[PDB]
């Protein structure tokens, strides 16, 4: 792959790529569609609209939007103007967004109507710098200083030229959370999604123009941003977008061609979703679907899930591991080379190292800390030099995973170095769940560990010491955490215990709980 | 009142004041008591202990503690060492404390056991700098880095001398919320509580050594910090402290001498609490109590409440108004000169100015914005230069209240300039409540305004537009807000309306919601 030119605007790059196909559908959702021509027009009008309200090159805007045809307009329109969109999870709390508004110094917000109430709460409580709120598909009356997204776009003539950015300039941020502390602002450059889209989307998955791409992973996830925006636009594929939660039935409806007149040929999701679909009584037969490629990321794919999918559909699931920091997969199985129980082989263009307790080589078959040297690495965590130093060191990026290299050069996941769990393919901190549990008045102590379920998928498990003299049932605890935590964070079971194993010092010996001591 | 010397440590000042009375009870609560000599010992030992764990002069520590004998030890111990305690409301959420930890850069936390769960959650989610957590009255096992308050104090010999602070050096912070944005870190000097305790506690209230002081307002409130710490210690009075919620029954128990063998002679509370007590069927008769003085702050005192108190007890309620920024009352009725329906007269030592829309004078009987020139003003909002400039206007402090001056020189509250609500004597932003309500899926729009109850006391009232096609009941909304707002933020009622009154641009006509148009 040839490097991008040093003068490079990623949005203009994707627009230019598709000037050969102006009338092909770029994006389609339940209620709307954009050809590549329409996408370019709306992208450049939104770029002008943001400039017209005073947002300047290198300033940030918060992009808080459900998947839908407005999402790539917002993302690419900001980037075309040299404005940095901060693309964020749509399932967070008002306090999370308040932090992100202050930390990013966002100058405007592009928000789905369904998400306006949580954004409103975030605005009210924070010391933010938001000059304008642009609401895509409002679900309630607008306030002054608020404008409808379609009117905002339609009220401004398209920007005549993109900002004269360099390839290594920041282009967008994503946020990623560790086991403690605030979400970290992961800074990606214009070059980084070129590298992922060429090295992985094109050269590994072999996506092509006649594909129809559909990702259960939403666009704010690094994984979904490639799957359903940067990869398909790089090759001219058509992309199906879906705002609603990706239940098996919602996914099947689209596989069967229920939206946009198109049947997806490429699907992407997490192993948990593949397990849920395989368990579904109305799982489609392979003659009903047009899938030619099934991608997975976000947690290790249990071998039996892949084998069951392959037996049913005659298609493998192609498991690869990326991260927010590396943007897309750096280890992956191939469409025609799949070893279940492993994450496959290094993606060409990426160098992989396993390092031991002194930073040196580990022997084959032995676990080591995974480090990645590749051209798509984020540059830093914005405003956090200490965590940046720990992670981005001289061309290498520390993943926080442990891996084992097998004799065929494949890599087998061996756990984390930082207590984080990957549940439904999404990062969950056990410490957050514990801190929620101990706020119930009947809970004295709580410890949360990851346990593999009947399909080998890790779910949280809570061990709770009740306060003596209080009655506390499993159902009341379930009720307590229902609206306090997002559903993927729910402990799969709770065990009430009389005490927790602690060192002579008071630290919970969580390994004894994973070993089943209680 | 003689100014404090330029070299001045407020904690040393209060300790030195009471060396004449070492064996008199300084503080007593339900389970413990401290004489003035015991208080001095523990104060100076805690000061040494904080220095030993590496907290330096001018660094902050978070003081998150229920009222009890350990509270003045924590507050005065920090100040004696030159460490700045940040004394905070005990009813807030983990999100609230996470921000306070980050903004104050607190280096340690002194926390009541009952508040350890919410602190634990705040520590886990925040980018804090907390090195050690000191737990007063632990209610669960300690974690590493955590130490019992009594053990911590007991492990260190008393510091020999106070830090060599200046009268105008920062001594402590309180946090003050506005109608939007983050709570503001109000910075008070060593001199400031000297001035309030001399000008108001001694020279206006005439507190004296044989008083027993008891405040329904907790110690983290500027009002309570004077009532039940700086004022009584200035004159050698004994203070009764109570950790639990100040219900009528809990207050009455203490009035009648149920704790510490002492009957309070001076009571302080909010008009809402006085109204609740006067309605109670078990209101004590005046021969049963030792009250000689009844102080009120936090919201305007309806004349019917004061008249009813006076008819029953033969005591007036002495209403004054202070602020977090001015630390104690700058307008007040006097013990023997009360005009109900007003906040009385300027406290000698404070200059009062009412200013109109152009900053000039206003005629008697006309409302103006209230400004205070007095020696107890905070110096700044830490880290917020813009709001500091709008508020601390060269020697004058803007209150954000409107007031009318009457012909006899008294002052009558005329409303806020900033839509804040004073409910149960406590600041509540209606915009915060509104933003919580609209996050219910059945709520389309909401507006919260202040409406008088049957005692003439302002409570929040919610006007809610339900979402069409959803079933939403007052009962369901009541259950929703139960656990996401503190009880004093509960709307007294909720009216469901088809539509809210708005201007041509969509802005809610909140005055007509108070004017009753719906």
Residue numbers in the entry:
A (entry chain A), B (entry chain B): 6 to 523
Provide the publication's sentences verbatim:
BadA catalyzes the conversion of benzoate to benzoyl-CoA in the metabolism of aromatic carboxylic acids. Its catalytic mechanism is shown as follows: benzoate firstly docks to the active site, where it orientates to allow the carboxylic group access to adenosine triphosphate (ATP) for the formation of an adenosine monophosphate (AMP) intermediate; coenzyme A (CoA) subsequently comes in to substitute the AMP-activated intermediate resulting in the formation of benzoyl-CoA. With the purpose to allow acceptance of various bulkier substrates into the active site, a double mutant H333A and I334A was created.
The mutant was examined against a series of carboxylic acids. To our surprise, most of the tested carboxylic acids can be taken by the mutant to form corresponding CoA products as opposed to the wild type that cannot accept them. Superposition of these residues and ligands for the wild type and the mutant BadA reveals that the overall architecture is almost identical except that the volume of the substrate-binding pocket is increased by 96.7 Å3 in the mutant. Three protein crystal structures in an apo form and in complex with a 2-methylthiazole-5-carboxyl-AMP or 2-choloro-1,3-thiazole-5-carboxyl-AMP intermediate validated the engineering rationality and synthetic practicality of the modified enzyme. BadA that underwent structure-guided protein engineering has clearly exhibited an additional dimension on substrate tolerance in light of 13 novel carboxyl CoA derivatives synthesized herein.
